[PDB]
Each structure stands twice: as structure tokens, then as C-alpha cells.
Amino acid sequence: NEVKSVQPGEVCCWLCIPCQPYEYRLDEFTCADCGLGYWPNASLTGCFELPQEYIRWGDAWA
Numbered sequence: 001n002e003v004k005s006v007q008p009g010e011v012c013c014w015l016c017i018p019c020q021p022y023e024y025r026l027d028e029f030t031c032a033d034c035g036l037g038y039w040p041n042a043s044l045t046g047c048f049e050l051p052q053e054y055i056r057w058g059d060a061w062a
Contacts, residue, residue: 004031
């Protein structure tokens with residue numbers, strides 16, 4: 001969950017740091033999701049963002 005390992009040396013206490021929410025975070029060392037793809041998450045299950053429009057007809061600013 002937004003945390004990925006860094007150190008490629010010792011296989012016992014590799015230095016692990018958090019990975020940014022707009023990253024890939026699928027492999028251990030990868031991160032770096034596709035540019036301008038799915039901002040929240042793009043490697044677990046279809047976490048595509050939504051273009052929230054002004055159409056609500058019940059919203060505060062509607």
C-alpha cells in the first residue's frame with residue numbers, strides 16, 4: 001500500500017520507503033506508473049479517476 005522497497009543488497013532488512021500515491025506500486029522496485037494515466041491507482045483493479053462534472057441538480061452549487 002504505497003510503500004515499495006529500495007535497497008537491492010541485504011535480503012533481510014532492505015531499506016523500504018513509501019511510494020507516492022500517483023505511482024504504480026505493483027512490483028517491489030518499480031513504482032512509476034504510466035504518465036497521465038490513472039492518478040489514484042493503476043496496478044490493482046481499474047482505479048480510474050472520474051471527470052466530475054457540474055451536473056448534479058441537487059448539489060450545493062447547482
